[PDB]
Design an enzyme around this catalytic site. Structure first.
Site, PDB file in Angstrom:
ATOM      1  N   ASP A 181       0.825  -1.213   0.000  1.00 58.17           N
ATOM      2  CA  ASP A 181       0.000   0.000   0.000  1.00 58.17           C
ATOM      3  C   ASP A 181       0.862   1.267   0.000  1.00 58.17           C
ATOM      4  OD1 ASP A 181      -2.581  -1.286   0.023  1.00 58.17           O
ATOM      5  OD2 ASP A 181      -3.167  -0.347   1.915  1.00 58.17           O
ATOM      6  N   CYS A 215      -2.447   0.717 -13.487  1.00 59.45           N
ATOM      7  CA  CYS A 215      -2.498   0.719 -12.029  1.00 59.45           C
ATOM      8  C   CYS A 215      -3.651   1.648 -11.657  1.00 59.45           C
ATOM      9  CB  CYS A 215      -1.133   1.089 -11.448  1.00 59.45           C
ATOM     10  SG  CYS A 215      -0.299   2.584 -12.198  1.00 59.45           S
ATOM     11  N   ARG A 221       3.490   2.580 -10.919  1.00 62.66           N
ATOM     12  CA  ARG A 221       3.774   1.147 -11.098  1.00 62.66           C
ATOM     13  C   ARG A 221       3.785   0.752 -12.580  1.00 62.66           C
ATOM     14  NH1 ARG A 221      -0.453  -0.917  -6.368  1.00 62.66           N
ATOM     15  NH2 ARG A 221       0.246   0.660  -4.841  1.00 62.66           N
ATOM     16  N   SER A 222       2.839   1.295 -13.370  1.00 64.35           N
ATOM     17  CA  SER A 222       2.773   0.967 -14.807  1.00 64.35           C
ATOM     18  C   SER A 222       4.047   1.390 -15.532  1.00 64.35           C
ATOM     19  CB  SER A 222       1.566   1.656 -15.447  1.00 64.35           C
ATOM     20  OG  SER A 222       0.307   1.109 -15.027  1.00 64.35           O
ATOM     21  N   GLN A 262       6.674   7.884 -10.432  1.00 69.66           N
ATOM     22  CA  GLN A 262       6.043   8.945  -9.632  1.00 69.66           C
ATOM     23  C   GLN A 262       6.866   9.405  -8.435  1.00 69.66           C
ATOM     24  OE1 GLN A 262       2.191   6.728  -9.148  1.00 69.66           O
ATOM     25  NE2 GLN A 262       1.306   8.781  -9.319  1.00 69.66           N
TER      26      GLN A 262
END
Ligand code: JJP
Length: 282
Positions: A181, A215, A221-222, A262
């Site tokens: 998370d 994502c 994440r992508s 990110q």
């Protein structure tokens, strides 16, 4: 510089935030006018994540052709990817329309439907064989065929039917279920094992349309997934694998979608994944 020793040099000097901010400063800025039209407000999950006009995927519809999705075309590596946000309640039919129209074999999902106690994307595929889904706005039917649950990821076989023509296709759903998370994984081993499973399925190969990767926003994440895949492919293709420059590859990908990677932690994790992956390939 090479990668593994550039890596240790940034760790010892603690300068990951400065490296990452340089990337943010040098990244391309292209218009995203279609994304910002008022009629498309409920088609975007986040107001600050939009596809560029020049690389956006168009739906084959004359009313409204807009979806928050971008084509990342890597010329030297000879790989293409579609990066998109997690589908919204009012865009699940658009999502499967794109999969159909672009002739994709695989969908790669890197988030859970709920994280941090909030919804990160719609439940856009069926959970039981006998309870299929119909998307009336785009005239598609989606059925769960089989499901294989493993410790770090789940693979599903899905049947997508175009109800207008009665044509059917098999879609593979690759769901990485254990990204934490907060932060990034401690080791890249399970993420790399997952990447190799997607590769082995044919979903990334030129005989199919581009894989669809998402994502929640379709950039963090992508971005890590396609950056690692492309860097490893280039290390196999070139005479000198130490010439592969992960920062230059990331800036090339950011010509096609804003914001890929990110955080500085995601940047460090991408380096780690490519470094460990290059040892297993040989
Ligand atoms: C093997 N297979 C097939 C379909 C399918 C849908 C889900 C999982 C596997 C599937 C649909 C039909 C026949 C065949 C073929 O591959 C395509 N047309």
């Amino acid at each position: 510089m090479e990668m593994e020793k550039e890596f240790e040099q940034i760790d010892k000097s603690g300068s990951w935030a400065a490296i990452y901010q340089d990337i943010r400063h040098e990244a391309s800025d292209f218009p995203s006018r279609v994304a910002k039209l008022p009629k498309n407000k409920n088609r975007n999950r986040y107001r600050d994540v939009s596809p560029f006009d020049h690389s956006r995927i168009k739906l084959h519809q004359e009313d409204n052709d807009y979806i928050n999705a971008s084509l990342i075309k890597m010329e030297e590596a000879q790989r293409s990817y579609i990066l998109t946000q997690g589908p919204l309640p009012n865009t699940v039919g658009h999502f499967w329309e794109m999969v159909w129209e672009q002739k994709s074999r695989g969908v790669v999902m890197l988030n859970r439907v709920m994280e941090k106690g909030s919804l990160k994307c719609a439940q856009y595929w069926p959970q039981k064989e006998e309870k299929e889904m119909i998307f009336e706005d785009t005239n598609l039917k989606l059925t769960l065929i089989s499901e294989d649950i493993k410790s770090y990821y789940t693979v599903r076989q899905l049947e997508l039917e175009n109800l207008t023509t009665q044509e059917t296709r098999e879609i593979l759903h690759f769901h990485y279920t254990t990204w934490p998370d907060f932060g990034v994984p401690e080791s890249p081993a399970s993420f790399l094992n997952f990447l190799f499973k997607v590769r082995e399925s044919g979903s990334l190969s030129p005989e199919h349309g581009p894989v669809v990767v998402h994502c929640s926003a379709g950039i963090g994440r992508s971005g890590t997934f396609c950056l690692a895949d492309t860097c490893l492919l280039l290390m196999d293709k070139r005479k000198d694998p130490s010439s592969v420059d992960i920062k230059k590859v990331l800036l090339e990908m950011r010509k096609f979608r804003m914001g890929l990677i990110q955080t500085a932690d995601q940047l460090r994790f991408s380096y780690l994944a490519v470094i460990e992956g290059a040892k297993f390939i040989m």
